[PDB]
Design an enzyme around this catalytic site. Structure first.
Site, short mmCIF file in Angstrom:
data_model
loop_
_atom_site.label_atom_id
_atom_site.label_comp_id
_atom_site.label_asym_id
_atom_site.label_seq_id
_atom_site.Cartn_x
_atom_site.Cartn_y
_atom_site.Cartn_z
N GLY A 16 40.24 31.77 38.03
CA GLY A 16 41.14 32.63 38.78
C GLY A 16 41.60 33.87 38.05
O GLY A 16 42.56 34.51 38.50
N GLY A 17 40.97 34.23 36.93
CA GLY A 17 41.34 35.43 36.21
C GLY A 17 40.18 36.36 35.99
O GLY A 17 39.14 35.96 35.45
N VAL A 19 38.57 40.25 34.66
CA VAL A 19 38.70 41.32 33.67
C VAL A 19 37.86 42.50 34.16
O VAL A 19 36.68 42.33 34.47
CB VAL A 19 38.25 40.87 32.27
CG1 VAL A 19 38.24 42.06 31.32
CG2 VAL A 19 39.16 39.77 31.75
N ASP A 136 41.84 31.08 17.84
CA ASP A 136 40.54 31.16 18.50
C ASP A 136 39.60 32.14 17.78
O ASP A 136 38.79 32.82 18.41
CB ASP A 136 40.70 31.57 19.96
CG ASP A 136 39.52 31.17 20.82
OD1 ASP A 136 38.88 30.13 20.52
OD2 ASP A 136 39.21 31.90 21.78
#
Ligand code: MG
Ligand code: MG
Ligand code: MG
Ligand code: MG
Ligand code: MG
Ligand code: MG
Lengths: 241, 244
Positions: A16-17, A19, A136
């Site tokens: 749902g994101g 870029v 990360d």
């Protein structure tokens, strides 16, 4: 529309994101737009895109002013649709260098790789000075700019240094260490990056974390690295094994 | 290893994706990698779990053209590897940067060439999705980032981690519009196809800003710039707003 931004390319979308690359029409400046839509119900899928987008913006605002961390240009909501406008960092992601013998070129590569790790280490240290662990760190998150300086792209996984979570994120090259917290997580990732910058992609994936010492020795025979540099990484990788 | 890795594609949730070559045959492959305890999500699924589920879905759909075949899978110690066939072509989202803005005073021949191309592409996705549903699978994540346009203009889907049996009762948001509340079964993919019909003709900025309440207006605006059959657009606007 009422939007000062024009979106020109769709980069990626997940959970749902989205870029996107865009342009500030008021100034022509290149921007990155991150967008997120809410997701209701069921806590077992934990944290929707809007929650992760808000956390990334918070982390980016705590890290403001550090060169190598994208600046937050704008943020707004259209209904429940969240938008995050970031500065566009030019350059190439470090993983795209792994796709492409002259002894002069071997030495030129060795110096190049050490300068990249060193810039990443300095950036990571500045982030720790703000109280944040990056968590990360690996070759897919590292941007190599045209002037050879470095940057990091995605800050969704970052968290305050105080936050003591045994959860530790796995590296593309080696298994994640068990009980590391705080800056030791980034300490472990940097060690893996020191080996990874010299190993072939095939060797990188196949070889396990127990063989770190052997891998360091093999690198030192092929590349003019100061030998202690590689041994300290192998020591850091095997500190609990 | 019979494979040589040539490029690192992406890494997410403890799982890496690599492009490689079978040294025995020179065939182009995709290698997906997972180590246990990595990528541990809030439902307890780690990267090895998602890799096993993806392999299951790809093996249930084997033989369907447009679904990547499972070439191999093996474990080195606890290191799980999944070898898939490489789908040639371009992802549909990469066309929005070139085969789109040039159609601002646009060439009507190129407007019509894009319109025919887009309707062909969308029709192939519907045919693939129908084959997948006939096999008992919902795709769940159908949008422009998952669609590959192959050199012969046929389509394929790439990522099958989000797929689930039609039975599985327990909806993912679309890049263009919010996911509808109470849809289940094959109706989830029916909604994604409706959103795809508008997205193939809307500019990226309008696509992101405008919500699904404005579907009818968007369909009308598309018909003013593109020679799309109006029933094509009306069925999309109906399916997108059928619950409002
Ligand atoms: Mg390992
Ligand atoms: Mg390995
Ligand atoms: Mg390949
Ligand atoms: Mg298959
Ligand atoms: Mg929208
Ligand atoms: Mg909407």
């Amino acid at each position: 529309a009422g939007l000062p931004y024009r979106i020109e390319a769709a980069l990626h979308f997940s959970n749902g994101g989205g870029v996107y690359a865009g342009i500030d029409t008021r100034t022509g400046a290149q921007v990155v737009l991150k967008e997120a839509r809410p997701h209701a119900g069921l806590a077992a899928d934990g944290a929707d895109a809007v929650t992760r987008l808000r956390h990334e913006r918070d982390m980016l605002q705590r890290l403001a002013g550090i060169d190598g961390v994208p600046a937050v240009l704008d943020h707004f909501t259209l209904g429940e649709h969240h938008f995050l406008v970031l500065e566009r960092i030019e350059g190439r992601a470090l993983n795209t260098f792994f796709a492409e013998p002259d002894p002069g070129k071997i030495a030129d590569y060795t110096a190049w790789a050490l300068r990249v790790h060193a810039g990443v280490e300095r950036l990571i240290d500045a982030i720790h000075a703000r109280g944040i662990v990056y968590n990360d760190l690996h070759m897919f998150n590292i941007m190599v700019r045209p002037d050879e300086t470095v940057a990091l792209i995605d800050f969704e996984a970052a968290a305050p240094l105080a936050e003591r979570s045994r959860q530790t994120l796995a590296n593309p090259a080696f298994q994640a260490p068990p009980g590391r917290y705080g800056a030791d997580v980034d300490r472990y990732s940097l060690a893996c990056l020191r080996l990874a910058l010299f190993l072939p992609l095939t060797t990188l994936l196949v070889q396990d974390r127990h063989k770190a010492w052997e891998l360091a020795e093999a690198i030192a025979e092929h590349f003019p690295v100061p030998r202690g540099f590689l041994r300290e990484a192998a020591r850091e990788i095997t500190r609990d094994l």
